[PDB]
């Protein structure tokens, strides 16, 4: 793993190199979105621009100084976050957690689904749990402005679950499609109640 690299670097390497699982570039991106972008209609849905997103990645990778995001399109930054969580070596929510969500929504009754989800999250590594707590707080703050951005928790889940779970998409078996639906449902449930 190269020195000062953000994308494609697992959270454990980030912890061993800096002491925190999320890089400061990604945290500053989240702060920029929280401070100057929460009212943008269709955030995380309206696509950015490939050139601007690639310039943002250029900024992140190799920069020893602090990465400034002022004067950047909100959708470019949102798509950059989606690409960072997509470009992780393993998904933030481990490959087993999508199957666990499927098992929860299939065999666990509705009144105990939240407890099973919390237990499943507690079965994750410490770094993944910290990053997930930070990201869930951020997405709750985002969806709190639903009167301005029209981003409901389920809408945010639809936009972000493929990046967080590393799901498949068709143009895949039935079990995998059920896993996709259950992962989206679980992400929406976690975002709605945070």
């Amino acid at each position: 793993y190269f020195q000062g690299s953000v994308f494609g670097v697992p959270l454990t390497v980030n912890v061993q190199r800096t002491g925190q699982p999320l890089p400061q570039s990604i945290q500053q991106a989240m702060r920029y979105l929280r401070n100057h972008c929460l009212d943008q209609v269709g955030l995380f849905r309206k696509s950015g621009v490939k050139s601007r997103i690639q310039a943002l990645r250029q900024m992140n990778e190799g920069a020893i100084d602090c990465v400034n995001y002022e004067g950047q399109s909100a959708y470019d930054v949102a798509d950059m976050l989606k690409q960072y969580f997509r470009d992780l070596p393993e998904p933030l929510m481990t490959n087993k957690l999508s199957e666990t969500f499927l098992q929860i929504y299939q065999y666990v009754p509705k009144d105990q689904r939240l407890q099973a989800i919390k237990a499943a999250i507690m079965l994750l590594p410490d770094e993944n749990r910290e990053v997930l707590q930070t990201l869930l707080y951020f997405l709750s703050d985002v969806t709190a402005a639903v009167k301005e951005n029209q981003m409901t928790p389920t809408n945010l889940a639809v936009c972000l679950a493929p990046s967080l779970f590393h799901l498949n998409t068709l143009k895949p078996d039935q079990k995998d499609l059920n896993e996709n639906l259950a992962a989206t449902q679980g992400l929406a449930h976690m975002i709605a109640e945070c």
């Binding site: 989606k82 409901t152 389920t154 639809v158 499609l177």
Partner: protein, 58 residues
Amino acid sequence: RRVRAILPYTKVPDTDEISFLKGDMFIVHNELEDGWMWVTNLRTDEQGLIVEDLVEEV
């Protein structure tokens, strides 16, 4: 429960949505929060997510 699309829509890339044309009928498999529905498009035989705002019950 079946629905019919009243407007064309293109999938957001790298998501579980499905594109459809005006008139496409879907069979609703699951109903989610905020008007989202997991459905199978009868034209393309693909399963995915659609929003209630673009469909009408039949």
